[PDB]
Amino acid sequence: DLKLPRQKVELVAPPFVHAHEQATKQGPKIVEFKLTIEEKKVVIDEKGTTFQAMTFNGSMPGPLMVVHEGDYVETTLVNPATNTMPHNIDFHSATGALGGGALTLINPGEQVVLRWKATKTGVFVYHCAPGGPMIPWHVVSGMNGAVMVLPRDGLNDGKGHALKYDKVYYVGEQDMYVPRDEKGNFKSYDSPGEAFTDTEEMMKKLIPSHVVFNGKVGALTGKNALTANVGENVLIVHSQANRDSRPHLIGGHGDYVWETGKFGNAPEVGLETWFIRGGSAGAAMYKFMQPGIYAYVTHNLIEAADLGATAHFKVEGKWNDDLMTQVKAPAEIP
Amino acid sequence: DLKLPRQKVELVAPPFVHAHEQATKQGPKIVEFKLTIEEKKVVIDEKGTTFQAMTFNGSMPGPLMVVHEGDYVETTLVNPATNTMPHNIDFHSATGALGGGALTLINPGEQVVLRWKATKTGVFVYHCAPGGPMIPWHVVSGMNGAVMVLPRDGLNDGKGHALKYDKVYYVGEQDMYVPRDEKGNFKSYDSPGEAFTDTEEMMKKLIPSHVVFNGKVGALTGKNALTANVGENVLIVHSQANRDSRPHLIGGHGDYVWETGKFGNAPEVGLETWFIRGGSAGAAMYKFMQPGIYAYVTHNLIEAADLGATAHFKVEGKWNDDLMTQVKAPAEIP
Amino acid sequence: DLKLPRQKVELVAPPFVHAHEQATKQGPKIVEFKLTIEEKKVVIDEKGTTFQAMTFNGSMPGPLMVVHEGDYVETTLVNPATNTMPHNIDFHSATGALGGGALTLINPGEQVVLRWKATKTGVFVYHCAPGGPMIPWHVVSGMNGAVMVLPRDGLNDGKGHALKYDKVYYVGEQDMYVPRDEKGNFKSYDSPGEAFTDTEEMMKKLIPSHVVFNGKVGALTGKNALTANVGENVLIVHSQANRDSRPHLIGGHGDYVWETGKFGNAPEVGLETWFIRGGSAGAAMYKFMQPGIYAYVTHNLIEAADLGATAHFKVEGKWNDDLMTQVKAPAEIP
Ligand SMILES: OC[C@H]1O[C@@](CO)(O[C@H]2O[C@H](CO)[C@@H](O)[C@H](O)[C@H]2O)[C@@H](O)[C@@H]1O
Ligand SMILES: OC[C@H]1O[C@@](CO)(O[C@H]2O[C@H](CO)[C@@H](O)[C@H](O)[C@H]2O)[C@@H](O)[C@@H]1O
Ligand SMILES: OC[C@H]1O[C@@](CO)(O[C@H]2O[C@H](CO)[C@@H](O)[C@H](O)[C@H]2O)[C@@H](O)[C@@H]1O
Ligand SMILES: [Cu+2]
Ligand SMILES: [Cu+2]
Ligand SMILES: [Cu+2]
Ligand SMILES: [Cu+2]
Ligand SMILES: [Cu+2]
Ligand SMILES: [Cu+2]
């Protein structure tokens, strides 16, 4: 007999986040979301390597869901008949039934509706988990995203001061396991089922072939670079459902970071690089001080430069010579 | 001339913990423990793979030792003549002599008695360390456990409030390196000595064949699942003497977590997944809110599902529909 | 028009650190440093394995630079014509232009002068980053070091009390990727360019052949052991520009640790093992209580004992039997 107001959310594809309030005068609501599973072959690199992806809402990562502490999150999970496998959903933000996984197993052609109370604040992973060896395989195939549960008074610095972001981006990092043939080329497969045996053999060796942001090498570069202006406070939510990551903003800092991702704890200040434990999401806020190109990377630089894990920010504004200056340009040695 | 009262402890096999007080009105005591080394071939998986184990007290992990700050811990380490190698013990809780290792090297047929003052609170690893390349080999063969040093006033939340657990479990995670033959089957050996060359070659490649809790795949499942009731506050001590781990309670949380494991620091609150640095123990407390099956995993899901690192909790009590409910069971899509 | 006093620093090779004040009554200064790049073939192990190194100032790690909050750091980077490749420098302590990398790219025969304002306190990595796949390759070839930015009032414990160290050491950990030939011996190369193809293939597999402190197996052992006396408070700065590490002082503790390395955050107390995220530096302070040999390791014990990552401390002073004692020496079992 839960008679609270209902609110529908129109999810948007990462790295963007659906519109939301930080601090709110709204009381608890039932917030309604819909996720539709899509299994699909996608291209993950600039060489044309293909991958058997499985996704929530067609994206890797799945979209970021944003609610406030004490809301009830009501998700309709849909598994169309065009898919081949059973799927479910496990929210790390939720309490009971394996995070919802034990209540959401659906075959192709079915849907289910789960409600959970958002009793814990922070950013949290959600992922598919349809039992046994299928659990890692569905997650590393792309079936993961995140939810953010905000305090109703918004974020704070642990010393009584509000922290308000001007914009938020969600960076979902994906470790992928694409097998190679005898001569050393990546293999292509006709279905997720056909990719399973070779993929699992590689998975158990624990070394990914690719580590990407937003589903593909270079996804968050060029036309699709992240953007900001000097003076803007940007929140970057970072998740990794299976493997550790160490985010770093090249040329910047984490001014306020929740590396374990949970807003009941004060943020740490002034970090160079932070650590996202596999199976979690974290968040870092930075106020841009300088214009120009920044790279956002995992600071295993082999992964960042060679395996795919680099995003860019393009930042507009005025250069600050007090903070940094080229005193003397490259010249011949005296 | 140390004339304090003596107290003997009867150690018990993991995941259980010998009986102890949290807050105590006892003053410092000399607490007496005995560990007897056993080298033994064991089965580590449901396929019948064997492993040359080396253990404290016949178990992997070694038993949890519990004392209070300011106690003196007096350990009799015994290396029976039925063993083949020298062994020792290094306590991360202890100060000096390589943690005791430099004072406890014993050949088969010898015993030694070490006393150390428990000046640092928290959970800490202990492990064998008999010099050079033998150090990693004895540890990854199973020669590690943990000790817990409690404040005399018990645990607190860093904000002045007591945190009392209703029960404690010790989960020791073991990375194992079992070599394979040409056709790809795991190899069996007649002695630890015979397993050494092949095992060391694999170890140096840094990828385990198995990652297990309590010594074997499935050790903490079925009849041997962990248990709780709705409303019980459970402390889970987690150690990993060689390699990082990222614990996660599927369907729950870490309500209070000391991921670096040291009680001089306030716990973090409301975590989804925490991080145990290789060479350390950590502790997490959770009050169960929902009945049913939970899985406790490292959230590298490949390790958890495919390499062995999953435990279960079976929890009794009343389902809470406010926290989670299946609004609509699986049905055909409209 | 920046008219502050100038101060030159004479850098010294790691693990030592150039002389500096902790708390200072000096105001902001322009502190002047010079780094000269050297590409050179070096021996990294006791078997005589060679490696194509690239370094700042001829050392791995590069020297520790020490300044105070609000200083301006003016670095002359020199790339002599005896080198073969372009190089640059990226300071994680700096704000803008990819940490300075976008302003410091120099060919063999050129130098550049960069100034940045030290607005963030802590220890921070610096490394070369000359674009694309070259970034990881130059870093894992040895082109990284660290800078320490002290509060002007020196270090504190977060509870109002000064923490003053008696001496500081800088331990730079390097993951190295040396390829093997068919029969399994490590390969030697005539130039960094010639080592590139084989080295990159190995790098992308993410498993190092060697993990060393101060450039070589055994660098910080024997005549070159670290030293202290009972009663001395020693700060150990640890960096790792590419890969995670888990420092541990065998027989000691981290009395005060900033594992994310940033002095705006209070240190954690009483750690056994701490965690240095790849792409960062951290710092730990310990007051020695016992004489004798200590080992300082990463507590992946395979890396420590088998791949090269062990340093020693030799500590003078009086043994404390209250803290630890051998109650009974090794004797035959009754
Ligand atoms: O040329 C035959 C020879 O090649 C190997 C690979 O070294 O196997 C290749 O050819 C087989 C027969 O065509 C294929 O089945 C196999 O997939 C392919 O690798 C050898 O095993 C074989 O003797
Ligand atoms: O059949 C001989 C042929 O097999 C190889 C493996 O490819 O070696 C196998 O046989 C050897 C002789 O019986 C064994 O010593 C060895 O352990 C086994 O792998 C080849 O090396 C050999 O030419
Ligand atoms: O002995 C020839 C035989 O050896 C292999 C390695 O198994 O190749 C070796 O010899 C080649 C010719 O000398 C070299 O080019 C190569 O580098 C070396 O590995 C086989 O490929 C070849 O059939
Ligand atoms: Cu799925
Ligand atoms: Cu999960
Ligand atoms: Cu041993
Ligand atoms: Cu140890
Ligand atoms: Cu360089
Ligand atoms: Cu960097």
What is the DSSP track for B221-244?
SGGG-EEEETT-EEEEEEEESSS-
Domain ranges of chain A: 6-153, 167-316
Cα(B202) to centroid of ligand 1, in Å? 27
Q: In this complex, do A320 and C96 lie within 8 Å of one another by their Cβ atoms? A: yes
**Topology of the domain covering C167-194+207-316:** Immunoglobulin-like (2.60.40)
The set of catalytic residues of A is: 87, 90, 92, 127-128, 138, 143, 248, 272-273, 299
Question: Any chain C CB within 8 A of the CB of B105?
Answer: yes
| Six token digits for residue A209 | 């072939």
Chains that touch C (3 or more CB pairs under 8 A): A, B
Q: How far is A296 from chain B (nearest CA, A)?
A: 23
Q: In this complex, do B302 and A261 lie within 8 Å of one another by their Cβ atoms? A: no
**Number of other residues whose CB lies within 10 A of the CB of residue B160:** 6
- In the DSSP assignment, the letter for residue B101 is G
Q: Which of B95, B114, B122 sits opposite C327 (nearest CB)?
A: B114
Distance CA A159, CA A63 (A): 32
Task: Evaluate whether B77 touches B38 at the Cβ level (below 8 Å).
Answer: no
Which of B 170-209 lie inside 8 A of A, CB atoms?
207
Chains that touch B (3 or more CB pairs under 8 A): A, C
B167-193+205-316 architecture in CATH?
Answer: Sandwich (2.60)
Q: How far is C85 from chain B (nearest CA, A)?
A: 31
| Number of helices (H), then strands (E), in chain A | 3, 22
Amino acid A93 reads S
Question: Any chain A CB within 8 A of the CB of C258?
Answer: no
C6-152: CATH homologous superfamily? Cupredoxins -  blue copper proteins (2.60.40.420)
Question: Any chain C CB within 8 A of the CB of B4?
Answer: no
Give B327's contacts in chain A (Cβ within 8 Å).
74, 113-115
Residue B261, annotated ligand binder?
no
Query: Number of CB pairs < 8 Å for A and B?
Result: 165
CA A135, distance to chain mean position in Å, is 18
Q: In this complex, do C242 and A299 lie within 8 Å of one another by their Cβ atoms? A: yes
| Six token digits for residue C101 | 């990398």
Question: Any chain C CB within 8 A of the CB of A319?
Answer: yes
| Six token digits for residue C287 | 């007051």
Choose among B118, B110, B120: nearest CA to B29: B118
Choose among B196, B201, B162: nearest CA to B85: B196
**Number of other residues whose CB lies within 10 A of the CB of residue C152:** 17
Q: In this complex, do C111 and A330 lie within 8 Å of one another by their Cβ atoms? A: yes
| Residue C242 neighbours by CB under 8 Å, 6+ apart | A299, A300, A301, A302, C136, C139, C140, C144, C175, C278, C279
Amino acid B269 reads V
Distance CA A136, CA A126 (A): 13
Amino acid A227 reads T
Choose among C138, C86, C95, C135: nearest CA to A294: C95
Helix (H, G, I), strand (E, B) or coil at C134: helix
* Rounded-to-10 torsion of CA C156, C157, C161, C162: -30
Task: Evaluate whether A272 touches C125 at the Cβ level (below 8 Å).
Answer: yes
Q: Which ligand is nearest to the CA of A93?
A: 5
**Measuring CA to CA, how many Å separate A234 from each of A62, A237, B331, B334?**
21, 10, 41, 40
Q: In this complex, do A95 and B289 lie within 8 Å of one another by their Cβ atoms? A: yes
DSSP string, C202-257: HHTTT--SEEEETTBTTTTSGGG-EEEETT-EEEEEEEESSS-B-EEEET--EEEE
- Topology agreement, domain A6-153 and domain A167-316: yes
Give the technique used to solve this structure.
X-ray
Interface with chain A: mutation pick from C71, C92, C300, highest number of A CBs within 10 Å: C92
Interface with chain C: mutation pick from A206, A250, A286, A302, highest number of C CBs within 10 Å: A302
DSSP string, A248-288: EEET--EEEEETT--TTSPPEEEESB--B-TTEEEEEEEE-
Q: In this complex, do B103 and C326 lie within 8 Å of one another by their Cβ atoms? A: yes
Catalytic site includes residue C20? no
Could you tell me which residues of C are annotated as the binding site for Cu(2+)? 87, 90, 92, 127-128, 138, 143, 299
Catalytic site includes residue C128? yes
Residue A138, annotated ligand binder?
yes
Distance CA A131, CA B293 (A): 13
Task: Evaluate whether C176 touches C140 at the Cβ level (below 8 Å).
Answer: yes
Helix (H, G, I), strand (E, B) or coil at C274: coil
A167-316 architecture in CATH?
Answer: Sandwich (2.60)
Q: In this complex, do C125 and A326 lie within 8 Å of one another by their Cβ atoms? A: no
Distance CA B260, CA B227 (A): 25
Could you tell me which residues of C are annotated as the binding site for Cu cation? 87, 92, 127-128, 138, 143, 299
CA A272, distance to chain mean position in Å, is 20
Distance CA C208, CA B291 (A): 45
Q: Which ligand is nearest to the CA of A54?
A: 4
**Angle of CA points A161, A163, A165, to nearest 5°:** 165
Which of B 118-137 lie inside 8 A of C, CB atoms?
119-122, 124-125, 129, 132-133, 135-136
Q: In this complex, do B250 and A106 lie within 8 Å of one another by their Cβ atoms? A: no
Q: Which ligand is nearest to the CA of A182?
A: 1
SS3 content of chain C, % helix, strand, coil (to 5): 10, 45, 45
Distance CA C5, CA C10 (A): 17
Question: Any chain A CB within 8 A of the CB of B269?
Answer: yes
Choose among A229, A277, A231: nearest CA to A122: A277
Helix (H, G, I), strand (E, B) or coil at C307: helix
The resolution, in Å, is 1.4
Could you tell me which chain A residue has the CA closest to the CA of B333? A110
Amino acid B328 reads K
Question: Any chain A CB within 8 A of the CB of C241?
Answer: yes
Q: Which of C268, C289, C326 sits opposite B265 (nearest CB)?
A: C268
Q: In this complex, do A324 and C116 lie within 8 Å of one another by their Cβ atoms? A: yes
Question: Any chain C CB within 8 A of the CB of A332?
Answer: yes
Q: Which of B274, B305, B322 sits opposite A135 (nearest CB)?
A: B305
Q: In this complex, do A295 and C112 lie within 8 Å of one another by their Cβ atoms? A: no
Amino acid B320 reads N
Distance CA C320, CA A55 (A): 61
Q: Which of A251, A273, A332 sits opposite C97 (nearest CB)?
A: A251
Helix (H, G, I), strand (E, B) or coil at C179: coil
Q: How far is C77 from chain B (nearest CA, A)?
A: 37
Buried b (16+ CB within 10 A) or exposed e, C116-138: bbbbbbbbbbbbbbbeeebbbbb
SS3 content of chain A, % helix, strand, coil (to 5): 10, 45, 45
Note the helical H segments in chain A.
134-140, 192-203, 301-302
Q: In this complex, do A114 and B324 lie within 8 Å of one another by their Cβ atoms? A: yes
**Measuring CA to CA, how many Å separate C304 from each of A183, B196, C60, C222?**
35, 18, 18, 16
**Number of other residues whose CB lies within 10 A of the CB of residue A197:** 10
Query: Number of CB pairs < 8 Å for B and C?
Result: 165
**A6-153 under CATH 2.60.40.420, yes or no:** yes
